[PDB]
């Protein structure tokens, strides 16, 4: 078949293509997201659209089921495979044990398969990561994240992509209990997180909220433009 | 399975060019000249086989190896790699003739063969063929002339040439061969252009002339070979 | 220096360095001295540990009723070959209903380690097994090496600075065939006592001894089981 | 491991060391750095302290830039001298 | 039996310059009718059809595998498939399983893509190629088919007499056996146009 | 035996894909193909690589391949390299039509081929495919669609295209000529001819060096229009008449 | 001009050349032998020799004339280790011809099949090309005797008289003048020329025991190896 | 001089294994203790940012009902061994109607210790601390990526393990009670950690024959925090 | 530079260094020669003494593969034992599918093919063993074959291997292979082996002997040294 060692342990203890893969995620698109008691919200940016091309082909957000939604970063080619993979596993958790799928179970499948995808011969590690957002059964929130090494980990807020340190710095004033005490405020909270993110031009920004078990609805640049208007108006009233 | 390494030995150059395949093109240029002409009724191919010593007999080894009764073929480049794809195409036409019970189209041979050949360039741990095939035949009343290459591309020419001085010969075939002429003229200008780069000796054993009639391919004997060209061209 | 890369490549001198580099692993193991008499055989090993709280790692382990073995070097391939070693025991014990004479048994081991010493991408096995056993002609002591050469001996030793033990052997091993089990034991560990530094024990728990006989089945002796063997001995001089 | 701190003891005479700074804690966070890289650790302490106007470097202040100064310079190259002869 | 389970009769006959093929519309299990709108003959390419008699599963399956390799043939080579090449394709497909063969009675009636020249052939369930210069009949009862068509079919026939001939032949043959009926569909094709007609048959 | 492999599969420490970068450089050269937004139809054109008049031209459409009755493609790169992929995707389409008896929609089609191409990238050291080919077609749901294949395994599907690197000026031309909901496919055809009348190095715009393959939506035939150069020449001279009329301003 | 691993593996040079096969070409010189193939009208003669460094050498074990078929013998050059491996495969393919097709192999196709396998050795870079040289003869129905040769380029060959190897370059040009003129070839003609081409290159004129002379003629088509007793008769016949 | 990744060192030994031991230095530190009453084990979660969720990363998971374990270095690297070992012991319980011993887990993992190679690919560099209660009482075991097993009373891993064993054997004795060992762990932990002590920084893995399972529960650690 | 790495890779001189290094690898082993009388085949092995080293009669290079055939090997002992298993299994195939004694010829050929085959791939290495093969039978007679790591199958009346080779077979011309019965050949060989291999390099040593032929009724076995004690009797008195 195809037998070759792709990744080996260096004498410093750090692997090569694994830790180096994180640089591709730093050089990918920027994406954000938050969790809440009712409506969870995600984010995406750095689409680099020429406004003359259809947005559904460049779409960075998919979903396995109406309960659990998929969000990735980095290069899309390697994410396609992870998607279809996770679709088969989600459909198996549906098949046997008919209860809805838990983020802890599914993301663990992505991380495990990616781990052995960094172990066996003839397997080149992915240079991308992702973070999954949804709402747990019984109205609870649920989110987790992926890692090149396959380490699942749950955040209170999503900061990745180009300038992850910069956005994560802004989340320090986000974790206040007031934010977000309201879903109406959570949306504008994503616009306020994306305002310090990337160019923050109000065009490439795309977000979808999921309230309880209700499926998310992608908003057209109509309500997001009014939310930008109220952002600059909040900076106006703050003077 | 060998051990089954199967890693492609051909990288993509910074300019997008292929390494081993362009070198194989050098092996095609360093081969032997072979011309062909598609005009009117059928296709006429003219190869060249010269012996390095007087002890050699050309009644044994044949350069023209027809794959089908109505489909002939010649080549340029090294011979060893030629024999390979010969036996290949022989086993390759038989599935078509077995399923469909119908003579396979010349254009079908090319696609099947060049697909396996292109895979032979992408297959890991093995070098491409250094042979550029000239494929002919008559199908559906309209005969055909195709030319292959180590990378596997395929073309269609009225009159083409391979081997040394093929760029010089090509300008000759352009001006001297045009429109459509009978198979007799097709033989004539073929032998003239072959006598361009040939030595000062022309015998029935120095070259061979293959012809695809619409009645099907017939390999001419050295007798007629020296009968038309004696008195060459 | 680039011709040491593969196991397949022959050195310009004809010496494959992969096997030699495995022999260094054999020298980094604990010093163990096996010996046999015309009647009973005694094998002795040395236990080592990294920290004081850590229990000393045992070497000698029981396979066949009459076949004990020592070990040194890598424990991975050691226990792998030990599963193989158990297999070969119960095999004839089932089919033929009889055990295997060690003579023909180790040939199987050398053929087992022949393939990874030749085929590309395979590595040799670092091994410190010293095998003892009783067929109808009495005890046998062999030796194991990554080169897959087994030598029939009355006594042999491997490990750190184990040649100095041999120096004590040559004169003593000729006269230790007549002696019974009792003194044979302490004569076994007398070779190790000169391998370790002379300013410290040589305790009861840092050492492993086993006894196997034609009429005596092999039992692993350690800790308090070594107390009867160490008692009544003379300390080394200055 | 226990010797890495010695380079910190020589470089401690420069600038001013706060009495609460632990060298052994910082030393384990950078294996295989020899003395040069930890010299740049002590260097970037006061370097980033000048930009922040701080006279002495607090232990928690520079380490935030020390994990960055080891990782960011290991990102392009980990300096594998062990690989140079291997 | 195996072939009498679903039943069905397919009859194809060649005219002077044209060719016709017809088959019954009854679909049922044994003596139980299911539906009468079931389609047995399927269109393949242009000015050519294929008839099938046997288990409806093999009818549909073989129809789809046939369309599979068919399209792959016509996508590689722009020319339409030849009648001989079609018959040989079917022969191969049925011969692929020697001991696991599908149960069907293939009937191939179609015009030459080259000229107006028609062609007819029918194959055995194991894929045995067979050609006829008059008509091909495959179905439940062969006695009335071979019996009526020899006393009706003529060497030179215009589409009018071809239609009415195959009409009364299918009527008298189908009305004798109980596993066929529920109307009969007739496909008559020529170079100029394709004509499709549905006969008036007993619904009991 | 490990030293003989060039490690085409593994990444490049800069963050870039080493083999894939050189791969894209092949699409920059050789093939040249265009695409545009048209209502009630779609258009494609390509520049013939061998403009030599000695060819037989018996192959009909050459650089334009038809993988299905409702969809076609425009190839750019090595011919045979594609010819593996064309029969491949052709079988995938045909097994969709076999399984469901329904025309395969463009979405999952393209993405299926893209994952096939990705496979050769993550293992085996195999030679990836340096052929980026286009996609056209019609579905019931979304109607007319435009897509594009990339060696990296991502589909580069937009409403417009740049093939090859010579067409990056056609994209700047298309941003000035951007239109939404205007066809008149002939306007977009004179536009696309205006692209090669400037951006292309070959002047005079020889009708035998290019091939225009249009597909108009027809129910349910979906008519595929393959046009001859004779009626393209008068269209080219109509375009040159438009040029001669545009210089009449100043 | 060389770039990359092309010296160590089988590929094309920047100029299209192959280095491994050109090394195997001169691999025969390490054997230090010579083989001459001469064919007459009804006959064909194969002549070779052997080195006897020690008096312990057995003439029977070190004989270089191999017999593939009862009616078809052969000989090899260069190192014998590589030739032996080709011996059993020659014979195997002969037997499979006799099994599959039910009749004796023309031997024309034998060198071709063999040469295909030689192509595989030329193609894969992870296996040795096997640079031994194959030389065969044969008998065809009403075609007279035939003489074939095969070199590790993965191709087949066969001529009237052909001699390839270490010193065979000089024996060739000597043969070309002896064949023609108009000179006809009979049995004793060919036998008597076998030593002339060897002498012109060597001129050692030694005991016939070291040289082995194979022949194939249509009287009894069975291949036969000549005894030293009769060889010496031809050797004294050519020297008057 | 990169040789087949499986090839011995000139000194020598396995290259990649030797290198994989260094990856334990960059991992988190964990200090287990064996007591006559039970087995207590603690780890530092090493929280980088408040974005981290406390219960997301757990360095200690119980493989068998009565047998626990603690990992080292990378997490997902041990995942593969973790979940598979629990299956091992389970099947033991099925065939023999009896649970697997603490010692059995050792050879269970040692057989799969080094399976890497090419024909017929990278060895895990996660060290393992085996806790559990066999028929002889509470036991604590230690194993290494190379596969060498050794029984350790109180063993430390991670970065400061060299420094942690240091102050360990100083305060260690065989008369250690379980409640004493518990508060003896945190003394070393708070010296080797940069963050202040809180319930989210460290976790305690305790097990006893008469108290189980346990495992461990919340707010129990909160009482141990104020015990300093 | 790198040409000597893989045995499948050629060298600019048109050979393979792996075979070459394998050859002298066998030369550094202790001397092991062979000789054959008319009614049998004599084998001999010289065992060096380094320290003690261990019990007499251990890991002797004399192996018995078949009823009438045995292995006198030199070089690395492990590979010799593995190849002895290979000849054992091959001989078992012959005895299974035919049921009589495998002729020496095709035996050593079947082994030789393996020796050559492990030198056509980069995975495995050329063997570092060179062994003597000889046998006697009533319908066969006395044959002795010499096999080398390159894979060449041939044979003489006598051959020499080990560090002492040319000097070991020098006196062989003095000995009569034909007139001298095997009973006398034993002592005739042992005395020179005691005189050759000077004791300055190796102080102590030990000599093994084996024989098969008509006197043992085709049964090959190590000749018992307590029987006749031929060597030391005449070899200790042959120093003058
Ligand atoms: N262990 C150490 N103790 C004291 N100083 C050190 C240590 N390691 C590094 N240094 C300091 O780091 C500085 C940089 O080292 P330098 O780059 O000169 O090594 P180098 O000469 O490049 O090594 P090499 O000659 O092997 O390349 C030296 O001036 C040295 O004083």
Curated annotation (Swiss-Prot), chain A:
Keyword flag RNA-binding: no
Keyword tRNA processing appears in the UniProt entry: no
Positions of glycan attachment: 129
Keywords from the UniProt entry: Acetylation, Cytoplasm, Glycoprotein, Host-virus interaction, Nucleus, Phosphoprotein, Proteasome
InterPro entries linked: Ntn_hydrolases_N, Proteasome_alpha, Proteasome_alpha-type, Proteasome_asu_N, Proteasome_sua/b
One of the protein's GO biological processes: proteasome-mediated ubiquitin-dependent protein catabolic process
Induction line: Down-regulated by the ribozyme Rz3'X. Up-regulated in colorectal cancer tissues.
Phosphotyrosine found at: 152
SMART domains: Proteasome_A_N
CDD domains xrefs: proteasome_alpha_type_7
Location in or out of the cell: Cytoplasm; Nucleus
Modified residues (N6-acetyllysine): 226
GO cellular component assignments: cytoplasm; cytosol; extracellular exosome; nucleoplasm; nucleus; proteasome complex; proteasome core complex; proteasome core complex, alpha-subunit complex
Posttranslational modification: Phosphorylation by ABL1 or ABL2 leads to an inhibition of proteasomal activity and cell cycle transition blocks.
Molecular function terms from GO: identical protein binding
Family: Belongs to the peptidase T1A family.
Function: Component of the 20S core proteasome complex involved in the proteolytic degradation of most intracellular proteins. This complex plays numerous essential roles within the cell by associating with different regulatory particles. Associated with two 19S regulatory particles, forms the 26S proteasome and thus participates in the ATP-dependent degradation of ubiquitinated proteins.
Protein name per Swiss-Prot or TrEMBL: Proteasome subunit alpha type-7
Species, as recorded: Homo sapiens
Curated annotation (Swiss-Prot), chain D:
Superkingdom of origin: Eukaryota
Modified residues (N6-acetyllysine): 75
Localization of this protein: Cytoplasm
Assembly, per entry: Component of the 19S proteasome regulatory particle complex. The 26S proteasome consists of a 20S core particle (CP) and two 19S regulatory subunits (RP). The regulatory particle is made of a lid composed of 9 subunits, a base containing 6 ATPases including PSMC2 and few additional components. Interacts with NDC80/HEC; this interaction is detected only during M phase. Interacts and SQSTM1. Interacts with PAAF1. Directly interacts with TRIM5.
Signal peptide positions (record): none
Protein name: 26S proteasome regulatory subunit 7
Family: Belongs to the AAA ATPase family.
Entry PTM: Monoubiquitinated by RNF181.
Purpose: Component of the 26S proteasome, a multiprotein complex involved in the ATP-dependent degradation of ubiquitinated proteins. This complex plays a key role in the maintenance of protein homeostasis by removing misfolded or damaged proteins, which could impair cellular functions, and by removing proteins whose functions are no longer required. Therefore, the proteasome participates in numerous cellular processes, including cell cycle progression, apoptosis, or DNA damage repair.
Gene: PSMC2
Induction of its expression: Expression is not cell cycle-dependent and occurs throughout the cell cycle.
Swiss-Prot record, chain F:
Lineage, opening ranks: Eukaryota, Metazoa, Chordata, Craniata, Vertebrata
Assembly: The 26S proteasome consists of a 20S proteasome core and two 19S regulatory subunits. The 20S proteasome core is a barrel-shaped complex made of 28 subunits that are arranged in four stacked rings. The two outer rings are each formed by seven alpha subunits, and the two inner rings are formed by seven beta subunits. The proteolytic activity is exerted by three beta-subunits PSMB5, PSMB6 and PSMB7.
Gene Ontology BP terms: proteasome-mediated ubiquitin-dependent protein catabolic process
InterPro entries to which the protein is assigned, alphabetical: Ntn_hydrolases_N, Proteasome_alpha, Proteasome_alpha-type, Proteasome_asu_N, Proteasome_bsu_CS, Proteasome_sua/b
The gene coding this protein: PSMA4
The UniProt record lists the keyword Iron-sulfur: no
Cell compartment(s), UniProt: Cytoplasm; Nucleus
Family, per entry: Belongs to the peptidase T1A family.
Protein source organism: Homo sapiens (Human)
Pfam families found in the cross-reference section: Proteasome (PF00227), Proteasome_A_N (PF10584)
Modified residues (Phosphoserine): 12, 74, 172
Source organism, top-level taxon: Eukaryota
Protein name listed in UniProt: Proteasome subunit alpha type-4
Curated annotation (Swiss-Prot), chain H:
Any one Gene Ontology cellular component term annotated for this protein: cytosol
Pfam families in UniProt: Proteasome, Proteasome_A_N
Subcellular location: Cytoplasm; Nucleus
Keyword Glycoprotein: yes
Residue positions where Phosphoserine is found in the record: 9, 49, 56
Induction entry: Up-regulated in colon cancer cell lines. Up-regulated in fetal Down syndrome (DS) brain (at protein level). May be the target of the transcriptional activator NFE2L2.
Similarity-based family: Belongs to the peptidase T1A family.
Protein name (database record): Proteasome subunit alpha type-5
Organism: Homo sapiens (Human)
Gene that this polypeptide is encoded by: PSMA5
């Amino acid at each position: 078949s195809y037998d070759r060692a792709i990744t080996v342990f260096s004498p410093d203890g750090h692997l090569f293509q694994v830790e180096y893969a994180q640089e591709a995620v730093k050089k990918g698109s920027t994406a954000v997201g938050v969790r809440g008691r009712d409506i969870v919200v995600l984010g995406v940016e750095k689409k680099s659209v020429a406004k003359l091309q259809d947005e559904r082909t460049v779409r960075k957000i998919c979903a396995l089921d109406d309960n659990v939604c998929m969000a990735f970063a980095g290069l899309t080619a390697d994410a396609r495979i992870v998607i279809n993979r996770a679709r088969v596993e989600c459909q198996s958790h549906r098949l046997t044990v008919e209860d809805p799928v838990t983020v802890e179970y599914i993301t663990r499948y992505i991380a495990s398969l990616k781990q052995r995808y960094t172990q066996s011969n003839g397997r080149r590690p992915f240079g991308i990561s992702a973070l999954i957002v949804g709402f747990d059964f019984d109205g609870t929130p649920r989110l987790y994240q992926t890692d090149p090494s396959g380490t699942y980990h749950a955040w209170k807020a999503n900061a990745i992509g180009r300038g992850a340190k910069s956005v994560r710095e802004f989340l320090e004033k986000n974790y206040t209990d007031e934010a977000i005490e309201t879903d109406d405020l959570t949306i504008k909270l994503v616009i306020k997180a994306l305002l310090e993110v990337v160019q923050s031009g109000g065009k490439n920004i795309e977000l979808a909220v999921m309230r309880r078990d209700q499926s998310l609805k992608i908003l057209n640049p109509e309500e997001i433009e009014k939310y930008v208007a109220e952002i600059e108006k909040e900076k106006e009233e703050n003077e | 399975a060998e051990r089954g390494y199967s890693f492609s030995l051909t990288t993509f150059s910074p300019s997008g060019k292929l390494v081993q395949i362009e070198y194989a093109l050098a092996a095609v240029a360093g081969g032997a000249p072979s011309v062909g002409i598609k005009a009117a009724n059928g296709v006429v191919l003219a190869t060249e086989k010269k012996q390095k010593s007087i002890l050699y007999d050309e009644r044994s080894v044949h350069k023209v190896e027809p794959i089908t009764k109505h489909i002939g073929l010649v080549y340029s480049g090294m011979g060893p790699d030629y024999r390979v794809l010969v036996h290949r195409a022989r086993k390759l036409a038989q599935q078509y003739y077995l399923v469909y019970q119908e003579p396979i189209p010349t254009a079908q041979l090319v696609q099947r063969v060049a697909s396996v050949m292109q895979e032979y360039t992408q297959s890991g741990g093995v070098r491409p063929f250094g042979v550029s095939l000239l494929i002919c035949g008559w199908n559906e009343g309209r005969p055909y002339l195709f030319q292959s290459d180590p990378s596997g591309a395929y073309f269609a020419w009225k009159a083409t040439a391979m081997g040394k001085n093929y760029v010089n010969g090509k300008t000759f075939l352009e001006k001297r061969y045009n429109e459509d002429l009978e198979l007799e003229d097709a033989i004539h200008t073929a032998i003239l252009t072959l006598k361009e780069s040939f030595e000062g000796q022309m015998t029935e054993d120095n070259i061979e002339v293959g012809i695809c009639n619409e009645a099907g391919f017939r390999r001419l004997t050295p007798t007629e070979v020296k009968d038309y060209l004696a008195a060459i061209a | 220096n680039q011709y040491d890369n593969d196991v397949t490549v022959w050195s310009p001198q004809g010496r494959i360095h992969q096997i030699e580099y495995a022999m260094e692993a054999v020298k980094q193991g604990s010093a163990t001295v096996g010996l046999k008499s015309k009647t009973h055989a005694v094998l002795v090993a040395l236990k080592r540990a990294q920290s004081e709280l850590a229990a000393h790692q045992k070497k000698i382990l029981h396979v066949d009723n009459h076949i004990g073995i020592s070990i040194a070097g890598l424990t991975a391939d050691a226990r792998l070959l030990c599963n193989f070693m158990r297999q070969e025991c119960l095999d004839s014990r089932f089919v033929f209903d009889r055990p295997l004479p060690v003579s023909r048994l180790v040939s199987l081991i050398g053929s087992k380690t022949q393939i990874p010493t030749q085929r590309y991408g395979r590595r040799p096995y670092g091994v410190g097994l010293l095998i003892a056993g009783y067929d109808d002609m009495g005890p046998h002591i062999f030796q194991t090496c990554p080169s897959a050469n087994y030598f029939d001996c009355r006594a042999m030793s491997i490990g750190a600075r184990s040649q100095s033990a041999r120096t004590y052997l040559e004169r003593h091993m000729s006269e230790f065939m007549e002696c019974n089990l009792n003194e044979l034991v302490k004569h076994g560990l007398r070779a190790l006592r000169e391998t370790l530094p002379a300013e410290q024990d040589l305790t009861t728990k840092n050492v492993s001894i086993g006894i196997v006989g034609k009429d005596l089945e092999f039992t692993i002796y350690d800790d308090d089981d070594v107390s009867p063997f160490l008692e009544g001995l003379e300390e080394r001089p200055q | 491991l226990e010797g890495r701190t010695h380079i910190f003891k020589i470089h401690a005479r420069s600038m001013s060391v706060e009495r609460d700074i632990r060298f052994e804690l910082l030393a384990r966070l950078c294996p295989n750095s020899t003395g040069a890289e930890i010299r740049s650790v002590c260097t970037e302490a006061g370097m980033f302290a000048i930009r922040a106007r701080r006279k002495i470097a607090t232990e928690k202040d520079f380490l935030e830039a020390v994990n960055k100064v080891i990782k960011s310079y290991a990102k392009f190259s980990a300096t594998p001298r062990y690989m140079t002869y291997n | 039996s195996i072939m009498s389970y679903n039943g069905g009769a397919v009859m194809a006959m060649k005219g002077k310059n044209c060719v016709a093929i017809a088959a019954d519309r009854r679909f049922g299990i044994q003596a139980q009718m299911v539906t009468t709108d079931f389609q047995k003959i399927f269109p393949m390419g242009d000015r050519l059809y294929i008839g099938l008699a046997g288990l409806a599963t093999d009818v549909q399956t073989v129809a789809q595998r046939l369309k599979f390799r068919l399209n792959l043939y016509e996508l590689k080579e722009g020319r339409q498939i030849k009648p001989y090449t079609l018959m040989s394709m079917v022969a191969n497909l049925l011969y692929e399983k020697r001991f696991g063969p599908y149960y069907t009675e293939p009937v191939i009636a179609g015009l030459d893509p080259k000229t107006f020249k028609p062609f007819i052939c029918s194959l055995d369930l194991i894929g045995c190629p067979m050609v006829t210069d008059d008509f091909v009949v495959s179905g439940t009862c062969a006695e009335q088919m071979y019996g009526m068509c020899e006393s009706l079919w003529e060497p030179n026939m215009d589409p009018d007499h071809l239609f009415e001939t195959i009409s009364q032949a299918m009527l008298n043959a189908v009305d004798r056996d109980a596993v066929s009926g529920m109307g009969v569909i007739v496909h008559i094709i020529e170079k100029d146009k394709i004509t499709t007609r549905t006969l008036k048959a007993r619904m009991d | 035996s490990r030293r003989y492999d060039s490690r085409t599969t593994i990444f490049s420490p800069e963050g870039r894909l080493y083999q894939v970068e050189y791969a894209m450089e092949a699409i920059g050269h050789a093939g040249t193909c265009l695409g545009i937004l048209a209502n009630d139809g779609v258009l494609l054109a390509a520049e013939r690589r061998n403009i030599h008049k000695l060819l037989d031209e018996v192959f009909f459409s050459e650089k334009i391949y038809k993988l299905n009755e409702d969809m076609a493609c425009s190839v750019a790169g090595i011919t045979s390299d594609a010819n593996v992929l064309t029969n491949e995707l052709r079988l995938i389409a045909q097994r969709y039509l076999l399984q469901y008896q329904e025309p395969i929609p463009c979405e999952q089609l393209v993405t299926a081929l893209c994952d096939i191409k990705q496979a050769y990238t993550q293992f085996g050291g195999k030679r990836p495919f340096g052929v980026s080919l286009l996609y056209i077609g019609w579905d019931k749901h979304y109607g007319f669609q435009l897509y594009q294949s990339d060696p990296s395994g991502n589909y580069g599907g937009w409403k417009a295209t740049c093939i090859g690197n010579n067409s990056a000026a056609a994209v700047s031309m298309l941003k000035q000529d951007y239109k939404e909901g205007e066809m008149t496919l002939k306007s977009a055809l004179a536009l696309a001819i205006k692209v090669l009348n400037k951006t292309m190095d070959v002047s005079k715009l020889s009708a035998e060096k290019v091939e225009i393959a249009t597909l108009t939506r027809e129910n349910g035939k979906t008519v595929i229009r393959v046009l001859k150069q004779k009626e393209v020449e008068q269209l080219i001279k109509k375009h040159e008449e438009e040029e001669a009329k545009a210089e009449r301003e100043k | 001009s060389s770039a990359g691993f092309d010296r160590h593996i089988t590929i094309f040079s920047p100029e299209g050349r192959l280095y491994q096969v050109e090394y195997a070409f001169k691999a025969i010189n390490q054997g230090g032998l010579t083989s001459v193939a001469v064919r007459g009208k009804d006959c064909a003669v194969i002549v070779t020799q052997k080195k006897v460094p020690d008096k312990l050498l057995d003439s029977s074990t070190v004989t270089h004339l191999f017999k593939i078929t009862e009616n078809i013998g052969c000989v090899m050059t260069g190192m014998t280790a590589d030739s032996r491996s080709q011996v059993q495969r020659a014979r195997y393919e002969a037997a499979n011809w006799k099994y599959k097709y039910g009749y004796e192999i023309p031997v024309d196709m034998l060198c071709k099949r063999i040469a295909d396998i030689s192509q595989v050795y030329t193609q894969n870079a992870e296996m040795r090309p096997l640079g031994c040289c194959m030389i065969l003869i044969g008998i065809d129905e009403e075609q007279g005797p035939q003489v074939y040769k095969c070199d590790p380029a993965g191709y087949y060959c066969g001529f009237k008289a052909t001699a390839a190897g270490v010193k065979q370059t000089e024996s060739t040009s000597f043969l070309e003048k002896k064949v023609k003129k108009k000179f006809d070839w009979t049995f004793e003609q060919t036998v008597e020329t076998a030593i002339t081409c060897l002498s012109t290159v060597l001129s050692i004129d030694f005991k016939p025991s070291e040289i082995e002379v194979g022949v194939v003629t249509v009287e009894n088509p069975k291949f036969r190896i000549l005894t030293e007793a009769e060889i010496d008769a031809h050797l004294v016949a050519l020297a008057e | 001089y990169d040789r087949g990744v499986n090839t011995f060192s000139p000194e020598g030994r396995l290259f990649q294994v030797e290198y994989a031991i260094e990856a334990i230095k960059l991992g988190s530190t964990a200090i287990g203790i064996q007591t006559s009453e039970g087995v207590c084990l603690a780890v530092e979660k090493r929280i980088t940012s408040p974005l981290m969720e406390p219960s997301s990363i757990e360095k200690i998971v119980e493989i068998d009902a009565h047998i626990g374990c603690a990992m080292s270095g990378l997490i997902a690297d041990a995942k593969t061994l973790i979940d598979k070992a629990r299956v091992e012991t389970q099947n033991h319980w099925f065939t023999y109607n009896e649970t697997m011993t603490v010692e059995s887990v050792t050879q269970a993992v040692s057989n799969l210790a080094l399976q890497f190679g090419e024909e017929d690919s990278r060895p895990f560099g996660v060290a393992l601390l085996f806790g559990g209660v066999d028929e002889k009482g509470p036991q604590l075991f230690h194993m290494d990526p190379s596969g060498t097993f050794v029984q350790c009373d109180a063993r430390a891993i991670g970065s400061a393990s060299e420094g942690a064993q240091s102050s360990l054997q100083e305060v260690y004795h065989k008369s250690m009670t379980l409640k004493e060992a518990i508060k003896s762990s945190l003394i070393i932990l708070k010296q080797v950690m940069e963050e202040k002590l809180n319930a989210t920084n460290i976790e305690l893995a305790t097990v006893q024959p008469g108290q189980n399972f346990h495992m461990f529960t919340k707010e129990e650690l909160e009482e141990v925090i104020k015990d300093i | 530079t790198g040409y000597d790495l893989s045995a499948s890779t050629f060298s600019p001189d048109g050979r393979v260094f792996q075979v070459e290094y394998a050859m002298k690898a066998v030369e550094n082993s202790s001397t092991a020669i062979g000789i054959r009388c008319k009614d049998g085949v004599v084998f001999g092995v010289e065992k060096l003494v380094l320290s003690k080293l261990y019990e007499e009669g251990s890991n002797k290079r004399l192996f018995n593969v078949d009823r009438h055939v045995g292995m006198a090997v030199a070089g690395l002992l492990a590979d010799a034992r593995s190849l002895a298993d290979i000849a054992r299994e091959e001989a078992s195939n012959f005895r299974s599918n035919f049921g009589y004694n495998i002729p020496l010829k095709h035996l050593a050929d079947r082994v030789a093919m393996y020796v050559h085959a492990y030198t056509l791939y980069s995975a495995v290495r050329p063997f570092g063993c060179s062994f003597m093969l000889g046998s006697y039978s009533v319908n066969d007679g006395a044959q002795l074959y010499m096999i080398d790591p390159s894979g060449v199958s041939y044979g003489y009346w006598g051959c020499a291997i080990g560090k002492a080779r040319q000097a070991a077979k020098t006196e062989i011309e003095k000995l009569q292979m034909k007139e001298m019965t095997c009973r006398d050949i034993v002592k005739e060989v042992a005395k020179i082996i005691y005189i050759v291999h000077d004791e300055v390099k190796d102080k102590a040593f030990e000599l093994e002997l084996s024989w098969v032929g008509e006197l043992t009724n085709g049964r090959h076995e190590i000749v018992p040294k307590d029987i006749r004690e031929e060597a030391e009797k005449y070899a200790k008195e042959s120093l003058k």
